[PDB]
Amino acid sequence: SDHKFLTQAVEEAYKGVDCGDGGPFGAVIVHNNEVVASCHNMVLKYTDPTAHAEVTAIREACKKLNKIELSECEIYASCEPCPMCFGAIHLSRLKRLVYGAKAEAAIAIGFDDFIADALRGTGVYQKSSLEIKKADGNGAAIAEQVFQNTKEKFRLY
Amino acid sequence: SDHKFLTQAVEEAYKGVDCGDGGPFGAVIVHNNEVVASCHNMVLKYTDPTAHAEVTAIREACKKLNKIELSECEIYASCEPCPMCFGAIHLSRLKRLVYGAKAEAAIAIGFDDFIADALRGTGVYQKSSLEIKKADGNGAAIAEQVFQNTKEKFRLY
Ligand SMILES: CO[C@@H]1[C@H](O)[C@@H](CO)O[C@H]1n1cnc2c(=O)[nH]c(=O)[nH]c21
Ligand SMILES: CO[C@@H]1[C@H](O)[C@@H](CO)O[C@H]1n1cnc2c(=O)[nH]c(=O)[nH]c21
Ligand code: NA
Ligand SMILES: [Zn+2]
Ligand SMILES: [Zn+2]
Incomplete structure (x- = not known):
């Protein structure tokens, strides 16, 4: 299950940068193995710097389920969520987060050094008790290769 | 001019609770004393837990200016922005944030303890660069009074 939905998130990343x-x-936001939302980063399409993949998925899933909490759903991210996205995941009350690549893989291709303290447990004020799983092996390697692969295909933002 | 725009953000808070x-x-997002956006929390209206006042203002200002960065603009928040909102403020490259009430004022009336380390200067992985001003005197009094006056006028989320 984890491999399938992380793969779907990676494919969404490729598709979004391709179009x-x-x-x-x-x-990808999933409710008991049913995909509620499957989105990618829409910052350029929407002219919205908040339209990261995770925030877009949360918005879509919440309007689809007609409620502002997703306590019965889990989120799969192709890359480690940023501070804004991790705060949005916390506010969504999503019960589990599985992400593929570490944020350093995205920083390596020139992205801003923007890492969530609450995700890595390095905060004084912001804490998290959300279940967080960093994928290993297969899906992790594939997810880490995304930034070296998608790199001549877009301009940084 | 800070007091005027902070008072406008507080008025937006009151209006959103009334609605x-x-x-x-x-x-309230401004560009050299010209209001670019004036927003309040739209979580219940939009069925969107990411639709905080600050995120909504950022989206609307970026739509108004036809760009994803607001380096020439400043933001006035009625209350200390949460981690998600401070991350959005960092991503939008706003040059200055002025907030009225400390997050403890919102916590005291039933909201979650959800405080951004990067705003208070305790962040390790997330480090802020923008100028930050906490309101004093009459602006602080107004922003703090917001929560005492709106108690049980709205549904908690
Ligand atoms: C990585 O890095 C980067 C930098 O820092 C900035 C940019 O501007 O942000 C981040 N990003 C982007 N995109 C995204 C999504 O989609 N999601 C999340 O989470 N995050 C993100
Ligand atoms: C304060 O407290 C609270 C809790 O904690 C959670 C909820 O659930 O968040 C927060 N909030 C709300 N609303 C909002 C806006 O609008 N903005 C911002 O910033 N923030 C916010
Ligand atoms: Na408005
Ligand atoms: Zn993000
Ligand atoms: Zn917020």
Whole structure:
């Protein structure tokens, strides 16, 4: 299950950067193995710097389920969510987060050094008790290669 | 000019609570004394937990200026922005943030303890660069009074 949905997020990243919607980032929100939302970064398409893949997926899933909490759903991110996106995941009350690549893989291709303290447990004020799983092995390697692969295909933002 | 725009953000908070759009939070984005956006929390109206006042103001200002960065603009928040909102403020490259009430004022009336380390200067992985001003005197009094005046005028989220 984890491998399938992380793969779907990676494919969303590739698709979004291929059609010019935004950067190579994907996010899939799932409710008991039923995909509620499958989105990618829409910053360029929407002219919205908040339209990251995770925030877009949360918005879509919440309007689809007609409620502002997703306590029965889990989110799969192709890359480690940024501070804004992790805050949005916290506010969404999503019960589990699985992400593929570490943020350093995205920083390596010139992206801003923007890492969520609450995700890595390095904060004084912001804490998290959300279940967080960093993928390993297969899906992790594939997700880390995304930034070196999608790199001549978009301009940084 | 700070007091005027902070008071406008507080007025937005009151209006949003009256409308039932969301909670008592407002945000005003300006460009050299010209209001670019004036928003309040729209979580209940939009069925969107990311639709905080600050995120909504950022979206609307970026739509108005036809770009994803607001380096020439400043933001006034009625209350101390949450981690998600401070991350959005960082991504939007706003040059200055002026906030009225400390987050403890919102916590005292039933909101979650959800405080941004980067705003208070305790961040390790996330480090802010923008100028930050906490309101004093009459602006602080107004922004703090917002939560005492709106208690049980809205549904908590
Ligand atoms: C990586 O890095 C980067 C930098 O820092 C900035 C840019 O501007 O942000 C980030 N990003 C982007 N895109 C995205 C999504 O989609 N999601 C999330 O989470 N994040 C993100
Ligand atoms: C304060 O407290 C609270 C809790 O914690 C959570 C909820 O759930 O968040 C927060 N909030 C709300 N609303 C809002 C806006 O509008 N803006 C911002 O910033 N923030 C916010
Ligand atoms: Na408005
Ligand atoms: Zn993000
Ligand atoms: Zn917020």
